[PDB]
Design a protein around this ligand. Sequence first.
Ligand code: 0X8
Ligand code: MG
Ligand code: ZN
Length: 322
Amino acid sequence: QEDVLAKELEDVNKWGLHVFRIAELSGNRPLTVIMHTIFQERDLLKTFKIPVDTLITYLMTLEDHYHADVAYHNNIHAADVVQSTHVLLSTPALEAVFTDLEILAAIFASAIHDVDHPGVSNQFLINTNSELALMYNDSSVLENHHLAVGFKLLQEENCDIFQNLTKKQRQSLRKMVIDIVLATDMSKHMNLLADLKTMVETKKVTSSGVLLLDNYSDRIQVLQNMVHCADLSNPTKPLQLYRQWTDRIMEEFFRQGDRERERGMEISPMCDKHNASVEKSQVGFIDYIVHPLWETWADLVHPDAQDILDTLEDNREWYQST
Ligand SMILES: COc1c(O)cc2oc3cc4c(c(OC/C=C/C(=O)O)c3c(=O)c2c1CC=C(C)C)C=CC(C)(C)O4
Ligand SMILES: [Mg+2]
Ligand SMILES: [Zn+2]
């Protein structure tokens, strides 16, 4: 069984890795084994003097604080975003653009970006006067919490994977990780996309042909949009993968809508299981959210992302046809 898993982990650089098989083959440890593979592949353990045992211990503790009883925002989603961010970082147009520390931040941010998600939305947590909304004053409630949990777990026994970074390395990475995860709040999508559009229109490229990023503001904005693309990458994946993600988000949405109805509240869009239109909503989401973003990303790394954008367009057509 370990040999099959190791075979499937050979695809870690490929879009459309079969993350669900890896979850099964790893005994519900997709986040740990994919993170470990990626760190090996990028030589991050040697670069940052990360002890192997510390890495596994942190990864397992972090994976544990994703909820196995949440159908979408679980450890499989986290592994998927890590792996998708890992592939997006390897695109030719970005070669040698980001430092080792920035690659570490983006991968680490992807791994913690939804930890301890309870499977309800920010707006539900606000409307139900939840403790989380109360702690974070109704602003990026989930996103602030994922960051606080992800960083806090570094303090558990033999969990500080950043113990051999310099103080300035830690401080720079923490800030970058915060900037990235806070940008995954969907209420920020439009401002993030508008900013990425502006950057593509004024895009500058080096003599080697690679994207030129002058300053923190441009670098962090590309890393924020990269992780945001990886977060919204389900509809760019091969259809058998995309369909399982759709099934899982609808289970989680529907269960929020039951809670909402049980409490007298109006049902949030896509959460009413007596008035759903699964296929229509996927097309709506692609047309108004996912495709505008992925088309803008494709222009930034043109033509590196043309197969991913083509798969998205085919998957949109297929859902439309139904
Ligand atoms: C109200 O705006 C909408 C909306 O109008 C339709 C939507 O539709 C979806 C559809 C989704 C998924 C969706 O989730 C994306 C991933 C989130 C994560 O990992 O946290 C959504 C939406 O979130 C969504 C939102 C955004 C929600 C809020 C509260 C601003 C995830 C996976 C796939 C299969 C792509 O389907
Ligand atoms: Mg999230
Ligand atoms: Zn997410």
